[PDB]
Amino acid sequence: AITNSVYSADGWFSLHKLTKITLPPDCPQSPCILFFASAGEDYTLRLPVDCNPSYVF
Amino acid sequence: RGNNGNMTFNYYANTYQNSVDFSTSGILNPLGYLK
């Protein structure tokens, strides 16, 4: 998203909690949801561009 | 057949019970035709 148009920004993912997490006594409060981000089986990429060399600075 | 629920048995004849004409020898049609 250079110019933040609909051709580059495709909306939002959001995680709500529907029902609250029920714990018994003697269990840790605030558990953690570990996120991942993979590609789908129909994911495709096109037009290789020049890199961002900012990792090496 | 009118308001008649009898399907079984007529005791009197059709000339006694009813009154039939003498001789001279569902699909509801329109009452007017455009010709």
């Binding site: 529907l18 029902t19 609250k20 029920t22 714990l23 018994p24 006594p25 | -």
Partner: protein, 254 residues
């Protein structure tokens, strides 16, 4: 096994403690026919309304007594948005059609734990006026007798009689004759009921009918030792199966 997901349109609801869907009175209550009392072409199901609608219901506490119930009308909770139950394009289709004919399909979610006890009686109750004039309605002697059901006032001409009974009573011991499942705190976190269309006519008015009322009644009160999760929240999911809308007109104004 007990892990079932029920897809309907763009909506899929999950449970991992499924007791099986309680189909009411027939094998497939989704099988329905167009009404014989309307000559226009009806509006059948389409993919924007062939879905589940999830609303909240009031929390269940220790203070809630036995037989204290809580009623959800269908489609009356879509009109008034009871429990945040916005009906989307189903209510938008319902306000524009004079008659409507559908069976329902409900799921009431309530997750307890293995340290909680108590039971809820989630039932689909035909033809009650339990939404008419707390968080929970108490089972008094007026509800058990039908003594408080709505009535036409006789006027000043008549001596006002001692009202003692009405046919829209609740016998709280016979609510398991209805299409019901019990939401025990030690068997399941949700229950499934599938009901067909019933009514005095082949199709009924959209704004007035209460052919089915979702009824959540406390059979055993909630109990837990302190430290456990207090006041678990009851929620419900409603899916209309085979609607036949009839009589298209403008959006409903009183």
């Amino acid at each position: 096994d007990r892990v079932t997901t029920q897809t309907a349109g763009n909506t899929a609801i999950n449970t991992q403690s499924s007791l099986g869907v309680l189909c009411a009175y027939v094998e497939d209550p989704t099988k329905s026919d167009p009404p014989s009392s309307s000559t226009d072409q009806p509006t059948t199901t389409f993919t924007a309304i062939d879905r589940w609608y999830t609303g909240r219901l009031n929390s269940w506490t220790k203070a809630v007594k036995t037989f204290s119930f809580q009623a959800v009308p269908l489609p009356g909770a879509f009109l008034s948005r009871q429990g945040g139950l916005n009906g989307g394009a189903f209510t938008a289709t319902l306000h524009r059609h004079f008659l409507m004919k559908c069976g329902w399909q409900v799921q009431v979610q309530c997750n307890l734990t293995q340290f909680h006890q108590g039971a809820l009686l989630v039932a689909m109750v035909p033809e009650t006026t339990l939404d008419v004039k707390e968080q929970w309605v108490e089972m008094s002697d007026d509800y058990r007798t039908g003594k408080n059901m709505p009535f036409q006032s006789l006027g000043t001409y008549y001596r006002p009689p001692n009202w003692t009974w009405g046919p829209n009573f609740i016998n709280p011991y016979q609510v398991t004759v209805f299409p019901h499942q019990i939401l025990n705190a030690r068997t399941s976190t949700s229950v499934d009921i599938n009901v067909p269309y019933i009514g005095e006519t082949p199709t009924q008015s959209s704004e007035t009918q209460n052919s089915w009322t979702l009824l959540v009644m406390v059979l055993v009160p909630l109990d837990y030792k302190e430290g456990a999760t207090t006041d678990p929240e009851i929620t419900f999911s409603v899916r209309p199966t085979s609607p036949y809308f009839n009589g298209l007109r403008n959006r409903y104004t009183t």
